[PDB]
Amino acid sequence: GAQVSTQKTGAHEIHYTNVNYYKDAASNSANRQDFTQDPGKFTEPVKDIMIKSMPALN
């Protein structure tokens, strides 16, 4: 049970291996590459869709 993942490399011109040693999931290392984004919660929390090009208010 070894996990081969992709290292953090540069763009515009590379794997590491991981084995878990302990029985608890808290003993693992950090989730350094959990890239998720949902900004709509805070920037567009309104009920109606509010298209950009249209006027906000009639």
Partner 1 sequence: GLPTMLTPGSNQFLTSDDFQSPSAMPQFDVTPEMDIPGQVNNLMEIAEVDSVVPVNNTEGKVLSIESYQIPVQSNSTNGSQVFGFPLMPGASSVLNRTLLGEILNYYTHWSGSIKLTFMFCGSAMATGKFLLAYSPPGAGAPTTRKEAMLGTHVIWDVGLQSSCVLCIPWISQTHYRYVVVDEYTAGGYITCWYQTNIVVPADTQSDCKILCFVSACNDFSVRMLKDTPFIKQDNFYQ
Partner 2 sequence: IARVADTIGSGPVNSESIPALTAAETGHTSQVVPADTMQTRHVKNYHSRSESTVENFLCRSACVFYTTYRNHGTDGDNFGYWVISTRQVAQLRRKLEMFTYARFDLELTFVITSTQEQSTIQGQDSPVLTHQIMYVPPGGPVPTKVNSYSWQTSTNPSVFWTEGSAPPRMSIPFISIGNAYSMFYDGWAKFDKQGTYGINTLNNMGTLYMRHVNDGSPGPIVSTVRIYFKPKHVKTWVPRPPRLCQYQKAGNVNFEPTGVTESRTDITTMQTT
Partner 3 sequence: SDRVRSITLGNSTITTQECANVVVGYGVWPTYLNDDEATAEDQPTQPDVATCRFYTLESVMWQQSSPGWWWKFPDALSNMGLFGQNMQYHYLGRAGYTVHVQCNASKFHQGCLLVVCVPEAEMGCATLANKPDQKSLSNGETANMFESQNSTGQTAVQANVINAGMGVGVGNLTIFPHQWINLRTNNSATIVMPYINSVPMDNMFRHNNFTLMIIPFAPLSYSTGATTYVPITVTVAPMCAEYNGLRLAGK
Ligand X SMILES: CCCCCCCCCCCCCC(=O)O
Distance CA 55, CA 15 (A): 49
For CA atoms 16, 21, 26, 27, the dihedral sign is negative
**Least distance CB 14 / partner 1 (angstroms):** 19
Q: From residue 21 to residue 50, what is the string marking binding to partner 2 with x (rule CB under 8 A)?
A: -x-xxxxxxxxxxxx-x----xxxxx---x
Q: How distant, in Å, are the alpha carbons of 9, 29, 40, 56 from that of 37?
A: 21, 22, 9, 25
Which 1-58 residues touch partner 3, going by CB under 8 A? 40-42, 45-48, 50, 55-58
- Chain residues binding a second copy by CB under 8 A are 1-2, 4-5, 7-10, 14-17, 19-25, 27-28, 32-33
